[model samples]
Target: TATQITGVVLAAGRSNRLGTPKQLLPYRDTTVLGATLDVARQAGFDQLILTLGGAASAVRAAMALDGTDVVVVEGCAASLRVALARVHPRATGIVLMLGDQPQVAPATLRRIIDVGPATEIMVCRYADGVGHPFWFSRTVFGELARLHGDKGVWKLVHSGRHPVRELAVDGCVPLDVDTWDDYRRLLES
Candidate 1:
């Protein structure tokens, strides 16, 4: 059976180290957030939800470029979990992506979704460790929504009780905008 995979883009970080809002940063012609949203849509995610924090208005202003239907979510606590909850009453499955990873291609997303089981976590792997853009089934939505603290959904993934589907992605896992140096590297790349 086909699952309804909602694309939940986590964009609520304050970007304090970058000295500016990462989402607002110009990447080519579009902002980083705008670019990621395009990539997510192109990857076949019909439902897009934007989890916003800090300068939400600025982020929303930047997202107006393509007239994308990005439902802006509020709050900085457990952003990924919260985003999933907001969409829970409607969606059955979720593809949790980050706004910082503008370089994560659509093909990679499709690869992950293709292998995911109905009730497991689909994770992308790097050489060093595991990372984000995890897909979750409806069964785990409740635990994900109630998650607390600054950490991501990794706690659930590492718990080992739930089944995990791993997708080995080559090369760097794309850049996460945490500092000015990282942002500079992203633009230079």
Candidate 2:
């Protein structure tokens, strides 16, 4: 059985569309990424990693990233590559998380990892659609390492070459902050 399961939070982005460091946007007594990391922390992961790029310095300056190892990288794929490289030596898997998905529960993380040893890929089937907190075995790390841009993981998930396990989760897909209205919808709900 795989002993070390790492939690990889991909937060590195320019927030180009939003025109602000969305990671630093205020949410639930902490910034957006901060709240997301809080859930990762509560999940009791053996290891946790967060990546930052656009406002990497500001993120470090604004938050208390107690147990998380921070890696600053340029693109989404680079974030995964950098995080994969830093995982614990024995890490056999990762539960891929998103920075703006602060609504994801520790229970969701638990459910994903619950079937960890048996699946090469795992994703949550929310009431509305598939979403993050995905699980990937080390076996696919090579492919993940080769992914190029922001939608790399999704592309891989839909590659039709690998089997994906979809865990049932309650509620609609958690809104990831992509636009001002997206964040506004998040706040209103």
Candidate 3:
């Protein structure tokens, strides 16, 4: 069994479509970032990496609820590659949890990791397609660190060459907070 696992929450996006920051949006009693961090901790992650880009101060404030020790890494640029690089190199496996996806429970993360392949991309497959909150072993973290532009690693999913294992997940993957309406829907739900 793998020894070390780290949780990476991508909280750096600009949220241009939403008009406000996605990380600050509230989910239940805590903000989206807060809820996600809590879930990661509960899911057995030993350390948490919070990537902050545009709204670094605000993101830092929100994540503070969990504890001061949560590693805050300034995003490298606009892409997930930059954020992934900020993660501690010692992290054996990465549990990539999107900050906007507050509904993704800790149990789901555990299930995915439990079924993770020994050397492939361990991802979640919804009815429509495969997506993240993916788990990346040290073997694949190199490719993930090089990911650039929006939709990083998506092209890899389509490559069909890599050893990719999909953990069948029920229902729609939680709607990303891309717009005000999307965030509102999450609140309503």
TM-score for each of the candidates? 0.87, 0.94, 0.84
lDDT of 3 by residue, 1-189 (tens): 336667777777677886667888778998877787777778766567666667778776555745423334442234456555655666667777777788887788888666663646777888877777787777776777776665556666555778777788887767778888888888987
Tens digit of lDDT per residue, candidate 1, span 1-189? 244567788888787776779888999798888888878878776567777777788876656734333445442346765566557355677887888899888888887666654557888887767776788888887777777765637677776878887788876667888888888899997
In candidate 1, list every pair of residues with a backbone clash: none
Error of 1 at 8 (Å): 0.5
Output the lDDT of residue 50, model 3: 68
Report the Cα lDDT for residue 89, model 1.
55
Candidate 1 Cα misplacement greater than 4 A, ranges = 1-3, 65-77, 88-90, 117-119
Better of 2 and 3 by lDDT: 2
Q: Give the alpha carbon lDDT tens digit for every residue of 74-97 in model 2.
A: 537878898888888788889999
- Alpha carbon lDDT of each predicted model: 0.74, 0.86, 0.70
The lowest-lDDT stretch of 10 consecutive residues in candidate 2 is 71-80
Instruction: Tell me the deviation in Å of residue 187 in model 2.
Output: 0.9
Shift in Å, residue 121, candidate 3? 0.4
> Which candidate ranks first by TM-score, i.e. highest?
2
